[PDB]
C-alpha cells in the first residue's frame, strides 16, 4: 500500500514533476526517500545540494515524514529553506 504523489523541483517552472509511490512499503525511512529524490531530481542548477527539504504545493509547511504526505497531492523539493513561489501545476 502506497500513496501516489508528485514531486516538483523548487523554482523550476517547466519541469513537470515525477510521480512517486511513497510509504514504509516503498522506502526504509524519510531519509531514504530524500536520497532517492536527490538522485531522480538532480540537476546541477536548481538542486545544487540535492533534496534536503520537501514543501507542500503552496509552501505553507515543510513535510517531515512519509505519513504526512497525502494521496494525490503534489510537493516541492528544495536544496534549502527558500520556497520558490511559481506555477508548478
Amino acid at each position, epitope marked *: 500500500a502506497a500513496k501516489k504523489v508528485r514531486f516538483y523541483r523548487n*523554482g523550476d517552472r*517547466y*519541469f513537470k514533476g515525477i510521480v512517486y509511490a511513497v510509504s514504509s512499503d516503498r522506502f526504509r525511512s524519510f531519509d531514504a526517500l530524500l536520497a532517492d529524490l536527490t538522485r531522480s531530481l538532480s*540537476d546541477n*542548477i536548481n538542486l545544487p545540494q540535492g533534496v534536503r527539504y520537501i514543501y507542500t504545493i503552496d509552501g505553507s509547511r515543510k513535510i517531515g515524514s512519509m505519513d504526512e504526505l497525502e494521496e494525490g497531492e503534489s510537493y516541492v523539493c528544495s536544496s*534549502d529553506n*527558500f520556497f*520558490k*513561489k*511559481v506555477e508548478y501545476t
Partner: antibody
Amino acid sequence: QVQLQQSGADLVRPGASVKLSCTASGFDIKDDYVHWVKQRPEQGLEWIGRIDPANGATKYAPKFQDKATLTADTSSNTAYLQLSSLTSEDTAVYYCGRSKYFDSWGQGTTLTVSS
Amino acid sequence: DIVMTQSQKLMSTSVGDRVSITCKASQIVDTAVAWYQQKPGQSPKPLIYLASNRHTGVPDRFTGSGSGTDFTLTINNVQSDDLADYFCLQHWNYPLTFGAGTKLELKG
C-alpha cells in the same frame, strides 16, 4: 506581461567599474533566478553567471568570477551586474535573462569601454 | 565547459522550404537544451524549452527535437520573417553554454 527592463547604454573609461541593472515586472525575482550574458559580434553569446535573489547565492562562469559581481534587491525587484577593472574586451551588449530557460530577456545594454 | 556545436555557420533557404538546424553537445545533456531566434539589434526570442517544447506564441512551424547530444530545430514552411540567427543553449551544467549560431539566409 513578464518584462525585464535593463538600464541605458553606458560609456565608461578603462580600469573603471560600472553597474548594469535589470528590473523585473510581472513576477517577483525572489521567486526566480536572474542570469546575465555577454554578446559580441564575433565571440557569440557567453554566459556570465546567475543569482538566486532569495538567499543571494551566485554562480559565475570561470572567465567572469574576478570581473563580475552579481547582486539583487528583492525590494526593488532589480538585479545588478557589476563589472570591475574594465578592459577593451568588455565592450559588448549585456542581457539579463529569466531563469536557466531564458524564457524572458531584457532588451540589452550596450557597454562601451573606451578612453 | 561543454561545447554546443552548430556546424552550419550559414544556411541558405527559400520561402516555403523546410530547414533543419543542428546542434551537437560535446557530452550528454539529456533534454536540458533550448533554442532562440535573434535578429540584428534585438534580444533573443525564446523558441524551445526542454529540447522539444514550444514557448507560448511560437508558431506551429517551429519544432525542436533530440536528446542526449544531438539536437535539431526544424522550421517548416519557412517565412521571410524566419531569416535570422538561431542558437542552442545547454543548461545541464555550469557554465551554461550557447552554440556559436546558425544564420539563416535567403538562397539567391
